[PDB]
Amino acid sequence: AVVKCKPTSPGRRHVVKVVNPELHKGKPFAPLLEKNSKSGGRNNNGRITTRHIGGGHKQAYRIVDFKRNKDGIPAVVERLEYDPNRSANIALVLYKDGERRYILAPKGLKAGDQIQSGVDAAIKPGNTLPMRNIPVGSTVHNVEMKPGKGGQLARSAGTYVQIVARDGAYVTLRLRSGEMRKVEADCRATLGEVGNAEHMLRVLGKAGAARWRGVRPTVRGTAMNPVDHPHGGGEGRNFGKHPVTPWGVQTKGKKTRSNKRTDKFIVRRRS
Amino acid sequence: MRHYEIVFMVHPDQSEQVPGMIERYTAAITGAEGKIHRLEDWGRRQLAYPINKLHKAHYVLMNVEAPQEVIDELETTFRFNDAVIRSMVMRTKHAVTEA
Amino acid sequence: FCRFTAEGVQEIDYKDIATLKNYITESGKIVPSRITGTRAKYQRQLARAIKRARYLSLLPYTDRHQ
Amino acid sequence: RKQVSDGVAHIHASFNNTIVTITDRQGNALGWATAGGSGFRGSRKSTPFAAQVAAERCADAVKEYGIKNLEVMVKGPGPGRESTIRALNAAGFRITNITDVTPIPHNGCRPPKKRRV
Amino acid sequence: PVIKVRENEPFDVALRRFKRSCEKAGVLAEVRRREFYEKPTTERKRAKASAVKRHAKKLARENARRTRLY
Amino acid sequence: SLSTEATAKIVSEFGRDANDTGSTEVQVALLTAQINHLQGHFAEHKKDHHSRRGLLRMVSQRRKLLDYLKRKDVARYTQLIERLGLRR
RNA sequence: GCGGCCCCCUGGACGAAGACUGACGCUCAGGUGCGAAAGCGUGGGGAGCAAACAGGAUUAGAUACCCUGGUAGUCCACGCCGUAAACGAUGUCGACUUGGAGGUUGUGCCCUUGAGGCGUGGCUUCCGGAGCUAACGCGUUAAGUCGACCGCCUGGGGAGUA
């Protein structure tokens, strides 16, 4: 769980780290792995598009099955891996017919638990269903936005979508942002909340932790020159200006939802 | 081995779908150990307040001596079977006889 | 006097719909033991039963509600 | 001038006004007359005679709707109900049944604090 | 609550019947308790001092009124 | 709450015979059985404080019966402390 | 301190007849544990109410009461605080000393002969007898007559402050 590190040195003075015994001490399952090169924020023209990205550890991509395309066949959970790509611990589930696949581990999940997908299975935590067999007032995760797309919403550690309503073909979800939305009822969704719920309680202690996380330093606006950033210059920390991004658009308040062909699904905007 | 009055209600229309459920409710209990001790169908009758916008729900009484755990699983069916509308399981002293 | 110590029942049971229509007022409120003279343990079991039957839609909560 | 010959009367009375709304059976209001509209401002707003003049104007406001018989609902405490139901048949009407439908909470929420003075 | 006026009934007796239903079911009393909040100290004080009022009127009624005045 | 049949088994596992139910090893055996069941309870709920007072009371009465038996008959006391499985 | 209903887990007390151990008891410095509300910490929630705050009044003045708004907070989980008019302002255990009315929860006998009367328990409320007390009052739940052990007080203010 959440433990505080004894302050022998400053980098160990402020660290609060999340130890967990259930994670499999061992090398991961190999055929579900593939290589995953880090980008540094650089597109095919080589330029930085997103700043503050690069460095850190080298890490390998665990192919995780979000689709749950296997149906009607039971499966049991072998062990729990720690995935570097995401915030939730993943589970290596083993089916009865002989297949091993990585899934997103929910909150209530231990090794040996039983999981079945399909339109049939049950309402236990772990089971994939359409959103026509999951009751109103429920609590789901790994929600599809398109039927067969794979699973988009509620995928971070500890997030959960409360199914609010059903008007005919449509299911009104209350998302985790506070946005309300209509989704298609035939889309798949897994029950429960995603695990690793204490992920928000780590505080990283020192600069090197965010550095080997994969994050570069972030330089303020008032430090830079008036060529580099619009909050440039001054004789000792003048600001005087409405806050903007480096590309002119005024930050800190301006709304830029600019989609206009998906507003039919939004019941309520975030408040 | 405790004795529970399970009183639940169903929709008005689905009184065709009530009886065999009781039979698998029979298979709920006597499959493991459970002795069903009463079965008094009060049937469809009139409601003092329209729960889910309908009067006249189908009252079914059923008394049982049973282990507790199959009754826990019976409530996991009573939550999620979308025919049963209101369902309480009270504990009693003995298994009783008359209406 | 009372009707339950004059009866001899070991628990007022909620299924007894005629006398549990008798013991509330018209306005669906539980009429006290001060003015009906019901003894105390049977009063508490009667109030417990009227609550359990109000949950079971065999008695109204109040009269006016839809 | 839509003819609806029967109807319901809501009489909302707090301690500071008396609003009388004559509605149809389905809840669509037909026009009202408060105690405070027809003159009667300040301390003369909460008198029972204010309820009398409110129901007086409210009965004559709906002559085009042809209300011949009505059902009195009343809501709230204070100098409302008695004087207005007395005036509502001096106006000329056939009040077929009367009800008090005041809203009571079942120990739900917290009311505001006590006025010291 | 509700009352019903049936046919061949005076209206003034129906108005008094409605006032009696209001006195019986308890509009006015519980509304007068539920304007402003009472701390549970004060409702405890109310009920206890009411009990003292009931017995301190009652025992003076039963045993101090059994002997005549003049 | 340590039903009667378990009490019957343990009193016919610690007593002189069937019916002697007030002897000291019997009382300490009932308290140890009840304590172990309730420690099965108190690993969960963590804060049931009135049941915690009942537990601390039967702990203290076990302690009183044990050092009474240690004062009177040490020979039975060592057999009890080796038979029932406790530290002191 | 605990307030709709239901289940799951659980402490304690009381009553009946007995059966069993045989003084295992009482009190407790230090120690430990529980301890309303307010308050603090991190994370969620946030309807109503509402410190702070703003505005309108009243007033000589009104940063108060009254009115219209309203953020912490109230709520849940996990940790902290350790205080109150934490109040029957009454330590705990045990014993003895006439009464009447009541409440709650049992149980025994006689006839359930009929909503019964007849006796023994537990907890609890009111008035009063002897006795005590500065008086007020307490009065079998004593502030009566006693015994054991603990805590505490020594004029008011300084001050439960340094």
DSSP D73-104: EEESSSS-HHHHHHHHHHS---EEEEEE----
Rounded Cα gap, residues B30 and F28, in angstroms: 41
Rounded Cα gap, residues A138 and A127, in angstroms: 13
Could you tell me the distance in Å between the CA of residue C43 and the C1' of nucleotide G110? 29
Distances (CA, A) of A16 to A5, A207, C48: 6, 14, 51
Please, which residues have CB within 8 angstroms of residue A2's CB and are 6 or more apart in sequence? A16, A17, A18, A198, A201, A202
The answer to whether A96 and A47 have CB atoms below 8 angstroms apart is no
Rounded Cα gap, residues B28 and B10, in angstroms: 18
Please tell me which chains touch B, using 3 or more CB pairs under 8 Å as the contact test: A, C
Kindly state the helix (H) or strand (E) to which residue B21 belongs, with its residue range.
helix B19-29
- Method of determination used here: cryo-EM
Rounded Cα gap, residues A19 and A196, in angstroms: 11
Kindly state the helix (H) or strand (E) to which residue A145 belongs, with its residue range.
none
CB of C27 within 8 Å of a chain E CB? The answer is: yes
**Most C-contacting residue of D101, D102, D107 (CB-CB within 10 A), to test interface:** D101
Rounded Cα gap, residues A251 and A235, in angstroms: 24
Range 30-59, chain E: CB under 7 Å to any strand G atom: 37, 55, 59
DSSP state of C59: S
Give chain C positions within 8 Å (CB) of E1: 26-27, 63-64
Residue of C nearest to B9 (CA): C56
The DSSP bridge pattern shows strands D18-23 and D6-13 to be antiparallel
Q: Report the SS3 class of residue E28.
A: helix
DSSP state of A198: G
- Cα-only R_g, chain C: 12
Please tell me which chains touch F, using 3 or more CB pairs under 8 Å as the contact test: none
In this structure, what token pair is assigned to residue E27? 């509009």
Using left for φ > 0, alpha for ψ between -120 and 50, and beta otherwise, residue A180 falls in beta
What is the residue extent of each domain of chain D?
Answer: 1-117
Q: How many residues does chain F have?
A: 88
Indicate yes or no: strand G within 7 A of the C-beta of C55: yes
In total, the C-beta contacts within 8 angstroms joining chain D to chain E are 54
Neighbours of B95 (CB within 10 A): 17
Residues pairing with A75 in the sheet: A95, A115
The DSSP bridge pattern shows strands A188-191 and A128-130 to be antiparallel
Phi and psi angles of residue E54, each rounded to the nearest 5 degrees, phi first: -65, -45
Please, which residues have CB within 8 angstroms of residue F49's CB and are 6 or more apart in sequence? none
Rounded Cα gap, residues A152 and A66, in angstroms: 9
- Of A24, A196, A194, residue with least CA distance to A125: A194
Q: Report the SS3 class of residue D32.
A: strand
Rounded Cα gap, residues A165 and F64, in angstroms: 62
The answer to whether D23 and D9 have CB atoms below 8 angstroms apart is yes
Could you tell me the distance in Å between the CA of residue E41 and the C1' of nucleotide G1? 13
The answer to whether A188 and A121 have CB atoms below 8 angstroms apart is no
DSSP string, F15-70: SSSSS--SSHHHHHHHHHHHHHHHHHHHTSSS--HHHHHHHHHHHHHHHHHHHHHH
User: For chain G, which bases have at least one atom within 7 A of a protein Cβ?
Assistant: 4-12, 19-25, 33-35, 42-44, 47-50, 65-67, 78-79, 103-106, 115-116, 126-127
The answer to whether B15 and B58 have CB atoms below 8 angstroms apart is yes
Fold of the domain spanning A195-271: Ribosomal protein L2; domain 3 (4.10.950)
Distances (CA, A) of B2 to B6, B53, B95, C48, D31: 12, 35, 9, 21, 62
Give chain D positions within 8 Å (CB) of C64: 99, 101
Cα F12 to the chain's mean position, in Å? Answer: 15
- Of A249, A227, A229, residue with least CA distance to A239: A229
Distances (CA, A) of A164 to A137, A139, B60: 6, 9, 30
Q: In what order do the strands lie in the sheet with B2-10?
A: B35-45, B57-66, B2-10, B84-92
The CATH number of domain F1-88 is 3.30.420.130: no
Could you tell me the distance in Å between the CA of residue F34 and the C1' of nucleotide G11? 12
Rounded Cα gap, residues C13 and C25, in angstroms: 18
In total, the C-beta contacts within 8 angstroms joining chain C to chain E are 13
Neighbours of A217 (CB within 10 A): 9
Distances (CA, A) of A126 to A15, A148, A191, A214: 33, 18, 6, 31
CA of C10 to nearest chain D CA: how many angstroms apart?
A: 31
What is the residue extent of each domain of chain A?
Answer: 1-113, 117-194, 195-271
Using left for φ > 0, alpha for ψ between -120 and 50, and beta otherwise, residue B9 falls in beta
Contact B82 A135 (CB under 8 A): yes
Rounded Cα gap, residues B78 and B70, in angstroms: 12
Rounded Cα gap, residues C32 and A29, in angstroms: 71
Q: Report the SS3 class of residue A103.
A: strand
Neighbours of A203 (CB within 10 A): 13
Rounded Cα gap, residues F3 and A106, in angstroms: 39
The 3-state DSSP composition of chain A as helix, strand, coil percent (nearest 5) reads: 5, 25, 70
The answer to whether D87 and D55 have CB atoms below 8 angstroms apart is yes
Nucleotide at minimal C1' distance from the C6 CA: G115
In this structure, what token pair is assigned to residue B94? 């003995």
In this structure, what token pair is assigned to residue D3? 């003819």
- Quick one: three-class SS letters along chain A? CEEECCCCCHHHHCCEEECCCCECCCCCCCCCEECCCCCCCECCCCCECCCCCCCCCCCCEECECCCCCCCCCEEEEEEEECCCCCCCCEEEEEECCCCEEEEECECCCCCCCEEECCCCCCCCCCCEEECCCCCCCCCEECECCCCCCCCCECCCCCCCEEEEEEECCEEEEECCCCCEEEEECCCEEEECCECCHHHHHCCCCCHHHHHHHCCCCCCCCCCCCCCCCCCCCCCCCCCCCCCECCCCCECCCCCCCCCCCCCCCCCCCCC
Range 19-78, chain F: CB under 7 Å to any strand G atom: 19-24, 34, 37-38, 41, 45-55, 57-58, 64-65, 68, 71-72
Rounded Cα gap, residues A75 and A69, in angstroms: 13
A and C touch with 3+ CB pairs <8 Å, answer no
Question: Residues D32-54, buried b or exposed e (16+ Cβ, 10 A)?
Answer: bbbbbeeebeeeebbebebbbbb
Rounded Cα gap, residues B36 and B63, in angstroms: 6
Residues pairing with A181 in the sheet: A173
Rounded Cα gap, residues E37 and A116, in angstroms: 54
DSSP state of A161: B
Rounded Cα gap, residues A190 and A152, in angstroms: 12
In this structure, what token pair is assigned to residue E43? 């409702």
Contact E38 D77 (CB under 8 A): no
In this structure, what token pair is assigned to residue D29? 């209001």
Please, which residues have CB within 8 angstroms of residue E10's CB and are 6 or more apart in sequence? none
Exposed/middle/buried for residue D81 (C-beta within 10 Å: 0-12, 13-18, 19+): buried
Rounded Cα gap, residues F24 and F30, in angstroms: 10
In this structure, what token pair is assigned to residue A70? 């296997």
Considering only the beta carbons, identify the residue of E1, E24, E26 that sits closest to C64. E1
Could you tell me the distance in Å between the CA of residue D117 and the C1' of nucleotide G68? 18
The answer to whether B29 and B35 have CB atoms below 8 angstroms apart is yes
- Please give the CATH architecture assigned to the domain spanning A1-113: Beta Barrel (2.40)
Residue with structure tokens 């199959």?
A: B70
Cα E12 to the chain's mean position, in Å? Answer: 24
- Of C6, C10, C19, residue with least CA distance to C41: C10
Q: Report the SS3 class of residue D23.
A: strand
Nucleotide at minimal C1' distance from the C51 CA: G5
The answer to whether F57 and F70 have CB atoms below 8 angstroms apart is no
Q: Report the SS3 class of residue D43.
A: helix
Range 14-53, chain C: CB under 7 Å to any strand G atom: 39-41, 44, 48, 51-52
Please give the single-letter amino acid code of residue A109.
Answer: L
Experimental structure resolution, Å:
3.5
In this structure, what token pair is assigned to residue B15? 């009184």
Distances (CA, A) of A58 to A36, A50, B61: 8, 19, 64
Rounded Cα gap, residues E3 and E19, in angstroms: 10
Range 29-88, chain B: CB under 7 Å to any strand G atom: 68, 88
The answer to whether B92 and B4 have CB atoms below 8 angstroms apart is yes
Residue of E nearest to D107 (CA): E34
In this structure, what token pair is assigned to residue A45? 């023209």
Residue with structure tokens 């008959």?
A: F73
DSSP string, B37-88: EEEEEEEEE--SS-TTS---EEEEEEEEEE-HHHHHHHHHHHHH-TTEEEEE
Rounded Cα gap, residues F86 and F80, in angstroms: 9
Residues pairing with A4 in the sheet: A16
Rounded Cα gap, residues B90 and B96, in angstroms: 13
Nucleotide at minimal C1' distance from the D107 CA: G4
The answer to whether A34 and A63 have CB atoms below 8 angstroms apart is yes
Rounded Cα gap, residues C25 and E25, in angstroms: 8
Could you tell me the distance in Å between the CA of residue D64 and the C1' of nucleotide G114? 70
Phi and psi angles of residue A135, each rounded to the nearest 5 degrees, phi first: -70, 170
The answer to whether C17 and C58 have CB atoms below 8 angstroms apart is yes
Rounded Cα gap, residues A266 and A145, in angstroms: 13
Residue with structure tokens 């109000």?
A: C54
Phi and psi angles of residue D76, each rounded to the nearest 5 degrees, phi first: 110, 170
In this structure, what token pair is assigned to residue A142? 């790994």
Alpha carbons within 13 A on the beta-carbon side of A13: 3
Q: How many residues does chain C have?
A: 66
Could you tell me the distance in Å between the CA of residue E70 and the C1' of nucleotide G139? 34
Please give the single-letter amino acid code of residue D32.
Answer: W
Distances (CA, A) of D116 to A198, D77, E40: 49, 21, 17
